[PDB]
């Protein structure tokens, strides 16, 4: 299901599908499929550049929410192996809006923590649209401590609309849990790398994003507040979300100059959704490179550097 501005790409795709049927549909129909396929694929490839060259911040947000995209499960599958999912906070529940586990990266063992919006409606409602109740963040703290204890690096993916705004979420110390998370992660003796795949932000995202390095795709928005919220509070409306997106600076290159993120991982054309494997390979390369130049530093120097980088936050 392509977005509104990806229409010319769609109709060309719509002609492309029935090519399979015409191959063996009925009445002996087996036409010269290869010629038409090649011409239509050429046109489609040419047109996507005609479509994805002129997208800006409001679009970037739409693309960051494309309802066909790799979630943390997808990146785990397409760049990680021997994945073991640990579920359980030890207190009140395991949460489906966060998925964590311990896996191997090119032999090396790692910890993977991140969100999972679910693909279709069913897995979206079963995972609460990637909105974690605090018990999830307590689980994430528990896993992060486990990873710290056994001299293990931590790889974290961040793809959350935000911490759930609900009765159950507020009752259980949402603020307290996120505060603790932000406290412990800033003392681990192991390197930390955190991407911004997909749509993330709204503070709750930061619960698992305080690390040595930070990386973001080219169509991923990292906003202290969703554009619609900023629009409602400030613009006194919702339709004016694109203006809020333009003003805030939620796009990766805008953030990059702000010394906030350490690298942008380029996407396959038309969005990572068109070539999830290519995006997974790019992410794996970026993660490995980040880990490499990180392992040289010792644990004490690692923590000191982490603290120093934090203090660089804010123009002050």
């Amino acid at each position: 299901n392509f977005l509104d501005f990806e229409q010319p790409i769609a109709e060309l795709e719509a002609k492309i599908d029935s090519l399979t049927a015409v191959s063996r549909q009925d009445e002996k129909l087996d036409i010269n499929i290869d010629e038409e396929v090649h011409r239509l694929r050429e046109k489609s490839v040419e047109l996507t550049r005609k479509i994805f060259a002129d997208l800006g911040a409001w679009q970037i947000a739409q693309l960051a929410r494309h309802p066909q995209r790799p979630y943390t499960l997808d990146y785990v599958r397409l760049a990680f192996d021997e994945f073991d999912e640990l579920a359980g906070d030890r207190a009140y529940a395991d949460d489906k809006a966060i998925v964590g586990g311990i896996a191997r990266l090119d032999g090396r063992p790692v910890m993977i923590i991140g969100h999972q919006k679910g693909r279709e409606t069913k897995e979206k409602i079963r995972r609460n649209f990637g909105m974690p109740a605090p018990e999830g963040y307590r689980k994430a703290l528990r896993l992060m401590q486990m990873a710290e204890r056994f001299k293990m690096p931590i790889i974290t993916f961040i793809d959350t609309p935000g911490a759930y705004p609900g009765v159950g979420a507020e009752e259980r110390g949402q603020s307290e849990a996120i505060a603790r998370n932000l406290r412990e992660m800033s003392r681990l003796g192991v390197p930390v790398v955190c991407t911004v795949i997909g749509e993330g932000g709204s503070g709750g995202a930061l619960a698992i994003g305080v690390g040595d390095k930070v990386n973001m795709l080219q169509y991923s928005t990292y906003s202290v507040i969703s554009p619609e919220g900023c629009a409602s509070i400030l613009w006194k409306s919702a339709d004016k979300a694109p203006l809020a997106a333009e003003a805030m600076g939620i796009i990766a290159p805008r953030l990059k100059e702000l010394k906030l993120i350490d690298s942008i991982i380029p996407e396959p054309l038309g969005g990572a959704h068109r070539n999830p494997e290519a995006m997974a390979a790019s992410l794996k390369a970026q993660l490995l490179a980040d880990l490499a130049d990180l392992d040289v530093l010792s644990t004490e120097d690692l923590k000191n550097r982490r603290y120093q980088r934090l203090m660089s936050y804010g123009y002050a």
């Binding site: 932000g201 503070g203 990292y222 906003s223 202290v224 507040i225 900023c230 509070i233 400030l234 613009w235 006194k236 003003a247 805030m248 600076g249 939620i250 953030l255 702000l258 906030l260 203090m311 936050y313 804010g314 123009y315 002050a316």
Partner: protein, 114 residues
């Protein structure tokens, strides 16, 4: 007034008084973020939401602070965190409990991810 109320008299020492907003996001809202910054600064008489004042409690050294909610909802601006760090550093260098009071409506949106 809060800091005076808690701390003893004559031992008050403000911290991070030279830190002032230095907006770079030039946030263009219905108003200009500089407009609200200046308006709040003049209306409340304080540079930012947070004030820090080293002092003493019943003869015991201590560091306190508080939020002036009137300042744009007392949002945690860059200066807010910088003064917080300054106070915590003062407490660390000189062994003395550090105290604070919370009053805010959320982080300073106009500064976005900062």
């Amino acid at each position: 007034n809060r800091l005076h109320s808690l701390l003893d008299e004559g031992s008050l020492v403000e911290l991070g008084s030279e830190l002032e907003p230095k907006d770079v996001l030039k946030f263009r809202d219905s108003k200009k973020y500089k407009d609200r910054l200046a308006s709040a600064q003049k209306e409340t008489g304080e540079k930012d939401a947070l004030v820090v004042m080293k002092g003493t409690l019943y003869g015991m050294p201590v560091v306190a602070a508080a939020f002036e909610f009137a300042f744009m909802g007392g949002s945690m601006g860059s200066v807010v965190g910088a003064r917080f760090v300054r106070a915590v550093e003062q407490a660390l260098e000189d062994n003395c409990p550090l105290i604070c009071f919370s009053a805010s409506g959320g982080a300073r949106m106009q500064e976005a991810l900062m």
